[PDB]
Design a protein around this ligand. Structure first.
Ligand SMILES: Nc1ncnc2c1ncn2[C@@H]1O[C@H](COP(=O)(O)OP(=O)(O)O)[C@@H](O)[C@H]1O
Ligand SMILES: Nc1ncnc2c1ncn2[C@@H]1O[C@H](COP(=O)(O)OP(=O)(O)O)[C@@H](O)[C@H]1O
Ligand code: SF4
Ligand code: SF4
Ligand SMILES: [Mg+2]
Ligand SMILES: [Mg+2]
Lengths: 272, 272
C-alpha cells in the first residue's frame, strides 16, 4: 500500500519547513516518499532539491504546449534521500482561481502512473487560508486520507485548524478523508504545548508532536537544506526524527468535532 | 467626494485590528467612515460594535429569502463614533468559492445607496492570502482606489505584499486602483522599520507608518474595544492617531513594481 497525507495550516506557520524535514527523516529511515507542492508559493520542495524553487507543472505544460506533452520523468525530480518532488503551481495573482493548478497536477500524476507501488508515503503541502477550489480538492476528491494540521498558539492558526476541520466534516459521507492530528510549531511561548493539546482534545484528535523554535532551521534553509541533511546531530534533527516516528506509528484518524468561537476564546484566556 | 481604501495583507498580520483602530481615530477627528468586512472570519467590525462579531449579509439574505428582501438599515450597524459597519460573509469551508460573499455584499451596498455623499472614507478589510475570486474584485472591478498593505519583517508577509502588488499591476490598464503604501505592524524585532522602508522603496511606494507591538491592544480587544476607545491616553492610541493623519494626508498612489524572489531574499540577509 501507500499512505497519502496532506499537511494544511495557515500561511507562514511552518508547513513547508516541517514537511520537508519530516520527509527527510522518513527517507533517512529507508522509506520511499513523494512530496507534491500544492501552494502557489511553489517553494515546498526547495530544501530537498537544494534549489531556489522548482519549476511548476503549470509552467512546464505551457512551455510544452499541453500537459499531455509532458512526461513524468521531466516533471518529477529526485533530491535528498531519493525523495521525489513536484510542484503544482498556479495562475498569476488576480487571474483565475489560485487553486486551479492543484487539480491539473494531481490528475497528471495519477494518469502518468506516479503512484507506483514502491512508494510508502505521499505528502501534499496545501495552502489552508481558504478551503475552496483546488485547495479543497485533496479532501473533496479523496486524495489525502490523513490530514495533519500545523498550528501554534496564535489565534489565527487555531482558527485555520478549525476551518480545515469543518471541511473534513463536510465531506465525511464520501471517501475516507480524516484528521490525523495537530502539529504544534512553537512560537516559544509559555504553556503552548498544553494549549494545542487542549485544542486537539476538543476537536477529537491528538497533538502528534511539539516542534521547538530553533535558529538552526534558518541556518539550514539559508543553505537550501533540511536540518536533517545540514546538521544530523542537532537537537532539532532529533525532533523531526521523533515526529516522523509518530506519523509512521499513528493509528488515530477521526472525523473531527469543530468548535465554536466562544470555545476558542475560552482556551486562550485559560492558558494565558 | 469620498475616498475608498482597501486594506490587504496575510492572515493574522493585524489587518482588522489596525483598520478598526485607524477608523476610530478618523471618527475621533470628525470623519464619517464605513467599514466593509471582506474576510470570511467576519470579525472585522467587532471592536467598533463592542460585539462578538456581526451577522453577515450572506447569512441575513438566506434568512430573509433573497438579498432583495434585505434593507440597508437592517444590515448596516453603527458603533463607536458613528462608524458604520457591515460584514460580507462567505460560504462554509469546502463549499463554494470563499470570496463569493464579497461580490454579493459590494453589489448590495452599491444598489441600496450605502455610498451616500456624506461619507468621507470607506475601508474594505480584505483577505490577501490569495488574490482571486471575490477577494480580487475590489481591484478587478475598481471598487478600492487606494490599497494599503499591512506587513511585517516576516518573509511570508512581504511575499503577500508582493503578490498583492502583482494583482494591482495586472489591472492597471482599467479603472484607477493604485498602491497607497505599506503599514508595518511590528513583531518587535531589530531593524524592522528599515526593512519595510527598503521594501516599499523597491516597490515604488512608501512605508506610511510603523505600528509598535503593544500589549494594550490585547487588553482592549478582550473588552471588545479599539485602543482609541479603551485608553485614549495610551502611547499606542497616539500611534493610530498618527497613522490616521498620514492616511488622510497621503498623496502618493502608484502602480507598484513587484520584485523577484532573489531581491526579497537579499533584503532579509542584508537587514539580518
Ligand atoms: N521550528 C522552526 N524554528 C525556526 N524557524 C522556523 C521553524 N519552522 C519554520 N520556521 C521558519 O518559518 C518561516 C515560514 O516557514 P514555512 O515552512 O515557509 O511556512 P509555510 O510553508 O507554512 O508558509 C520560514 O522562514 C522557516 O524557516
Ligand atoms: N500592534 C499590535 N500589538 C499587539 N497585538 C496586535 C497588534 N496588532 C494586532 N495584534 C493582535 O494580532 C492578532 C491578529 O490581528 P488581526 O487584526 O485579527 O489580524 P488579521 O485581521 O490580519 O487576520 C490579534 O490577536 C490582535 O489582537
Ligand atoms: S477564493 Fe480563489 S477563486 Fe474562489
Ligand atoms: S481559490 Fe477559492 S474557489 Fe478559487
Ligand atoms: Mg510553504
Ligand atoms: Mg481580520
Amino acid at each position: 500500500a501507500m499512505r497519502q497525507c496532506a499537511i494544511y495550516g495557515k500561511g507562514g506557520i511552518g508547513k513547508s519547513t516541517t514537511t520537508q524535514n519530516l520527509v527527510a527523516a522518513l527517507a533517512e529511515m529507508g522509506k520511499k516518499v513523494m512530496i507534491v507542492g500544492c501552494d502557489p508559493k511553489a517553494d515546498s520542495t526547495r530544501l530537498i532539491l537544494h534549489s531556489k524553487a522548482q519549476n511548476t507543472i503549470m509552467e512546464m505544460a505551457a512551455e510544452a504546449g499541453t500537459v499531455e506533452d509532458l512526461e513524468l520523468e521531466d516533471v518529477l525530480k529526485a533530491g535528498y534521500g531519493g525523495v521525489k518532488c513536484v510542484e503544482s503551481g498556479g495562475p498569476e495573482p488576480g487571474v483565475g482561481c489560485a487553486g486551479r493548478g492543484v487539480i491539473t497536477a494531481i490528475n497528471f500524476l495519477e494518469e502518468e502512473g506516479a503512484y507506483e507501488d514502491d512508494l510508502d508515503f505521499v505528502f501534499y503541502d496545501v495552502l489552508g487560508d481558504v478551503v475552496c477550489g483546488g485547495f479543497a480538492m485533496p479532501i473533496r476528491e479523496n486524495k489525502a486520507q490523513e490530514i495533519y494540521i500545523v498550528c501554534s498558539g496564535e489565534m489565527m492558526a487555531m482558527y485555520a485548524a478549525n476551518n480545515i476541520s469543518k471541511g473534513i466534516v463536510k465531506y465525511a459521507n464520501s471517501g475516507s478523508v480524516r484528521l490525523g492530528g495537530l502539529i504544534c510549531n512553537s512560537r516559544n511561548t509559555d504553556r503552548e504545548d498544553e494549549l494545542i493539546i487542549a485544542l486537539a482534545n476538543k476537536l477529537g484528535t491528538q497533538m502528534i508532536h511539539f516542534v521547538p523554535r530553533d535558529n538552526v532551521v534558518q541556518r539550514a534553509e539559508i543553505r537550501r537544506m533540511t536540518v536533517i541533511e545540514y546538521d544530523p546531530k542537532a537537537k532539532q534533527a532529533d525532533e523531526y526524527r521523533a515526529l516522523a516516528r509518530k506519523v509512521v506509528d499513528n493509528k488515530l484518524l477521526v472525523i473531527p468535532n469543530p468548535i465554536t468561537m466562544d470555545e476558542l476564546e475560552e482556551l486562550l484566556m485559560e492558558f494565558g
